[PDB]
Paper text:
[name] is therefore a multifunctional enzyme capable of converting collagen lysines into 1,2-glucosylgalactosyl-5-hydroxylysines through three consecutive reactions: hydroxylation of collagen lysines (LH activity), N-linked conjugation of galactose to hydroxylysines (GT activity), and conjugation of glucose to galactosyl-5-hydroxylysines (GGT activity). Here, we present the crystal structures of multifunctional full-length human [name] in complex with various cofactors and donor substrates.
Among these, a very flexible surface loop comprising residues Gly72 to Gly87 is not visible in the electron density of ligand-free [name] structures. Two tryptophan residues Trp145 and Trp148 proximate to the UDP-binding cavity consistently change their side chain conformations in structures with bound donor substrates. In the absence of donor substrates this residue partially obstructs the cavity, thus acting as a gating residue to host the UDP-glycan. All our [name] structures systematically showed Fe2+ and 2-OG in the electron density near the core of this domain, confirming that these cofactors are tightly bound to the enzyme and providing a possible explanation for the observed substrate uncoupled LH enzymatic activity. In human [name], the Fe2+ ion is stabilized by interactions with residue His719 and with residues His667 and Asp669, which constitute part of a HxD motif fully conserved in the Fe2+, 2-OG dioxygenase enzyme family. Residues Tyr656, Cys691 and Arg729 are fully conserved among LH isoforms and delimit the pocket hosting the 2-OG cofactor. In particular, the side chain of free Cys691 contributes to the positioning of the carboxyl moiety of the 2-OG cofactor in the direction of Arg729, forming a salt bridge with the guanidinium group of this residue. Residues 590–610 constitute a flexible loop capping the LH catalytic site.
Numbering used by the authors:
A (entry chain A), B (entry chain A): 33 to 71, 87 to 285, 293 to 591, 606 to 738
The structure:
């Protein structure tokens, strides 16, 4: 048994990049001892280091890269596997032969394993290593592969110093040419990989060639990145703050944007330490931003608008917003947030900063689906592809902070990373690539990790694909594509609490029920949308139907989702599908039709919703039920009334004395 | 001016028939003085009477018949008109020439009036009359017409004694050949006739030839028979009773016959003075008569049945019933009453007897139409024809007792008239004539008047034309043809009082109403009719619909007539047409389906009627309304329940513990 205390890991690193520190923590997990050289040219550095270990027969030494390497096994298993190899210096094997390709005939014939050599990782005796590395006397420009290559192809030297290759990946697993051979193997508190082509559990995982992101994905688990019983290994889980530059971007017509601007005033973070930047490409949103801008500039320390008059493409706008933080030494962090991002959690900026990352993004997914603000993998064309664990991450099966090749719409970048590591302005611009794709590619080409955190519930994304802009109030027609947000602005706040009970629902007259349904904004926007049409009109009324305006299917879904479940709750035994042919708003002013004579309605039950206040917009009677000697004298605006429409409830519309009355009614279940 | 005290009216009468006494009362009305001869042969009697008045130049004498004659004018007008004639002996004129027809050329040419002579009535001086009547020396067999005839055709004798004819009916109106010339002329307290062909108001109306009934019709008004301001002239208007033989006849299947037999026990007349006779030609009614016969024989003094086993035609049965009264000197009156005659008034026998007539009948008409138990006129073939005042009599415009040529189904005959005036047995039988027609013709051929009285409301006739006899209870299917009687037996007695109010209707639970609808007989006959079918059977039940039995249209009319008006009364504002596709009776016994799970009904409102008692037929729960915490614990048999079927009334059929439950239900207004 070789003593672990005589195994040394030697690696090269000119800078402490994020890939190097990841390699170091995988080594400290297995309690390795690592010698880092320099905090073909690295062969010159290894050769110099091996002159101290020229006579060290007692020492095993393994040399690997650091930027694209992670350790998966313990040193004792590593030394044990090296003894079974029966070699004095064991190299790594690969599926390809490079630099020179014609040397493929030189190599010995291997049955099923890999045949060629890879200098990215080898292990052997310090004496045998020294006799090999010290023969190097060449230029720094020439690669390291060709040197160790033909030395192995020397048949006499191959037999004298016992040189062999890890043909079946017992210790070294090179990913290029074997991505389909590598899977992960989980355990209680550690993860590992397995070569299913030879059924081996390698120690060293090296992401050579175009397998960088494949190692970033493996690096999220191996060795203790994420464990099924311990979770993440490096995320947080359980006096002034930094100064941040908040950059809002409105590059497309975004629904509920007034709610976005009002939400910026509620982020739990000292506003005097946040500098707001806002770019608006749409002339549609200039009113909305103008309404909120007085509150914005009085809340934050400094603000700035770049409206549509500058005519800046989204790439040029994102360059300027980030460059204004890089050229400001007081900008410690840069928070870029798009308009189509709703942040339910109001501490994301604090939590994302405390993760102490360079580029971290909060995970946001559209309500109920899989699409999110990140890509688990890429295609050869750098287009989208689904990773093996993409769905487990979106569904929050496995939580933590993950090395992800793509992020968008929301991310926090360290300020010093911008000036020192990505100092150019053409981050988003410069090519025919999408401005959000060139952003992520600009960070990966610098070896910078794009972190995605799903440890908390952060928020959701808005469906802004087909946003019909030809409406006086476009957010009304958004009951289909963004229902969870449509309910927050239009459904009464105490409606959901009314469905569960709590005794807020009232029965003013026998078999008529009174519950809050619509919000004051829903009624005001509905009245305005009706008057904007203008063309007002077997008891007759002065009314306008939702069909001629184009809001029937939208109001029918409000019936299916909100009044149906409310009907079955108040009438135990009745089941409703919310079918209604007659949906219309009625006007009551003393100049035309101030009242409505007694009548029945051709429907099973009716829903009568007020649309304005009592005493502010008009003064007059409500709804009178003759057979019961009971009248709804003081109606409530956002509240609605439910009564059977046939036989039992002969009701009369009492006259309006002054002003104008608006009510919404639907003869449902005819 | 001739003094009325020297005008004498001479007439012939071998017996005081009803036609003679009618002529006498018309004379006493105008205060005439009449000499009746004998209480061609009557010429011998007149000639003998004229020998006392041979030298009486001061006396005017008018000779007319008595049986077919009524007086229409006063003597002063009669004498005044005779003076204007300028004649010493004025005869009556006629359209026909008889006996000998060839003597038509003898008569003087008359322009437009009647040309020939009629010896039925003449007026003149007693001296001129004597010189004419005393020339008669012929046989009693030869008629009186030919004697006075050719004496007028003697041209010299016609000019010597001044003989003329009332050519234009100034005084004498002979009806034969001038029926279209005669109309009535009314006044405040007297009636009169008018010859619209000459515009004269005659004094004497003589019904010669086949115009007997036409005079009976005129005799009902002229002179004071019926006056518009005084009404009838001889009817009643404002201590033992006689003994009567009551004869009931069942010659056809008659509906509601059990109610007829039970009604015979309620006629306000001493039963110990009534002898019941009943003929039943139908085997269908032997059960019904057998059920009531114990009560009949214990009520009346003597009874007798002649069932279908004797096989007697209706003519032979009516002969026997009346002959048994004629051959009984103790039978003072004979009351013949048919089965299809409902007597609402229970004093008709008393009132018809107190009219002191020979043959009087109470007027009965089918409810709402014109057909009655009498004919106002006849046709040449003695078939039916409508009289000028037939509709005024049926509609009770003109009231009183009327000389009518036909009666049926109900009449009271004096006993002495049967033995003395119509003693033969072949009254109804003897010819191919209908037995009811030969009855009336047998009385008119004896100069006996058939009186019809409509001074009171007596009753109605039953529609027994198409009586479907192939039913366990045939009176159920009689809601169409006899609704007024169908309601008396099947509709609850307190239903009509419930519709008007009086606070008998109850509201046991909110918006459910409880009112009496059906009678105990209606439910018992409906349950039996259902079990007689036997074939019992989206909540399911053990039920039988009215359609498969054949009682849907009948139950639909009960809905249209009785539950519709009851719905609109209790729900002000709702209008019902009583449309129902689902009408069925449900069984509830613990052996198959004892209960019914909570459910709604596919209808606007439902009518749930119990069909048996609580505690006598079964013991179990009623109807429970879940949403109201209210249960119909103790239902009432004949009562019904009305509740809305949708949404608001989720109800459950509570289990029946013992016995069998029957309920009638109709899902009306789907
Ligand atoms: C929803 O319900 C809450 C409480 O159930 C309402 O809050 C009350 O509002 C009234 C008038 O606005 C105040 O007088 C009370 O003091 C409030 N109570 C609390 C506990 O805040 C709220 O107003 C309801 N929503 C709407 C739209 O009216
Ligand atoms: C119809 O109503 C009358 C009274 O409104 C009912 O007559 C009463 O009947 C009960 C029980 O049969 C007696 O105890 C009372 O004494 C009766 N009152 C009178 C004034 O007679 C009659 O029963 C109702 N009809 C039916 C079929 O029940
Ligand atoms: C590293 O050392 C710690 C404590 O010194 C020990 O718990 C852990 O198991 C060691 N790891 C290995 C791979 O031996
Ligand atoms: C008959 O006499 C009575 C009273 O004596 C008288 O009222 C009536 O008018 C008289 N009738 C005629 C026709 O003169
Ligand atoms: O005006 C009211 O209060 C009742 C209106 C109504 O019910 C209807 O639209 O028919
Ligand atoms: O049995 C009851 O009381 C209710 C029956 C009913 O309503 C039905 O026929 O559906
Ligand atoms: Fe209404
Ligand atoms: Fe029911």
């Amino acid at each position: 048994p070789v003593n672990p205390e005589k195994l040394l890991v030697i690696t090269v690193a000119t800078a402490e990049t994020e890939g190097y520190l990841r390699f170091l923590r995988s080594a400290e997990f297995f309690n390795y001892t690592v010698r880092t050289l320099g905090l073909g040219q690295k062969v010159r550095w290894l050769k110099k280091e091996m002159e101290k270990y020229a006579d060290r027969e007692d020492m095993i030494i393994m040399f690997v890269d650091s930027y694209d390497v992670i350790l998966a096994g313990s040193p004792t298993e590593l030394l044990k596997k090296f003894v079974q190899s029966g070699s004095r210096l064991l190299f790594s094997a690969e599926s390809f032969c490079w630099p020179e390709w014609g040397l493929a005939e030189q190599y010995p014939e291997v049955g099923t394993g890999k045949r060629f050599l890879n200098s990215g990782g080898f292990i052997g005796f310090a004496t045998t290593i020294h006799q090999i590395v010290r023969q190097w006397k060449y230029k720094d420009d020439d690669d390291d592969q060709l040197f160790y290559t033909r030395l192995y192809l020397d048949p006499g030297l191959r037999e004298k110093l016992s040189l062999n290759l890890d043909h079946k990946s017992r210790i070294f697993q090179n990913l290029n040419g074997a991505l389909d051979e590598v899977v992960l193997k989980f355990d209680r508190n550690r993860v590992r990989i397995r070569n299913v082509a030879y059924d081996t559990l390698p120690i060293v995982v090296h992401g050579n060639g175009p397998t960088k992101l494949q190692l970033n994905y493996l690096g999220n688990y191996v060795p203790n990145g994420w464990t099924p019983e311990g979770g993440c290994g490096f995320c947080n889980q359980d006096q002034p703050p930094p100064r941040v530059f908040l950059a809002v971007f409105v590059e497309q017509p975004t629904p509920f944007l007034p709610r976005f601007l009002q939400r910026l005033l509620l982020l739990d973070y000292p506003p005097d330490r946040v500098t707001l930047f806002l770019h608006n490409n749409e002339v549609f949103h200039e009113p909305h931003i103008a309404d909120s801008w007085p509150q914005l500039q009085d809340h934050f320390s400094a603000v700035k608008l770049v409206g549509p008059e500058e005519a800046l493409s989204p790439g040029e706008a994102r360059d300027m917003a980030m460059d204004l933080c890089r050229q400001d030494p007081e900008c410690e962090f840069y928070f870029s947030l798009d308009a189509d991002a709703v942040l339910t959690n109001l501490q994301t900026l604090r939590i994302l900063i405390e993760e102490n990352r360079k580029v971290i993004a909060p995970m946001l997914s559209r309500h109920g689906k899989l699409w999110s603000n990140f890509w688990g993998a890429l295609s050869p064309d750098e287009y989208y592809a689904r990773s093996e664990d993409y769905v487990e991450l979106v569904q929050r099966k496995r939580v933590g902070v993950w090395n992800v090749p793509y992020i968008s719409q929301a991310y926090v970048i360290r300020g010093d990373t911008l000036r020192m590591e990505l100092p150019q302005r053409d981050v988003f611009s410069g090519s025919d690539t999408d401005p959000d794709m060139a952003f992520c590619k600009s960070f990966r080409d610098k070896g910078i990790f794009l972190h995605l955190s799903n440890q908390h519930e952060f928020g959701r994304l808005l469906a802004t694909s087909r946003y019909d802009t030809e409406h006086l109030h476009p957010d009304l027609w958004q009951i289909f594509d963004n229902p969870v947000d449509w309910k927050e602005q239009y459904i009464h706040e105490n409606y959901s609490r009314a469905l569960e009970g709590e005794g807020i629902v009232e029965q003013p007259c026998p078999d008529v029920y009174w519950f809050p349904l619509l919000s004051e904004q829903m009624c005001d926007e509905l009245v305005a949308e009706m008057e904007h049409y203008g063309q007002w009109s077997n008891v007759p009324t002065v009314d306008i139907h939702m069909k001629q305006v184009g809001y029937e299917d939208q109001w029918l879904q409000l019936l299916r989702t909100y009044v149906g479940p409310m009907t079955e709750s108040l009438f135990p035994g009745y089941h409703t599908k919310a079918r209604a042919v007659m949906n219309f708003v009625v006007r009551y002013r003393p100049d035309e039709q101030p009242s409505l004579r007694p009548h029945h309605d051709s429907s099973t039950f009716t829903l009568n919703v007020a649309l304005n206040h009592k005493g502010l917009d008009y003064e007059g009677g409500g709804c009178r039920f003759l057979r019961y000697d009971c009248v709804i004298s003081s109606p409530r605006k956002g509240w609605a009334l439910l009564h059977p429409g046939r036989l039992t409830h002969y009701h009369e519309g009492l006259p309006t004395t002054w002003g104008t009355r608006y009510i919404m009614v639907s003869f449902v279940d005819p």
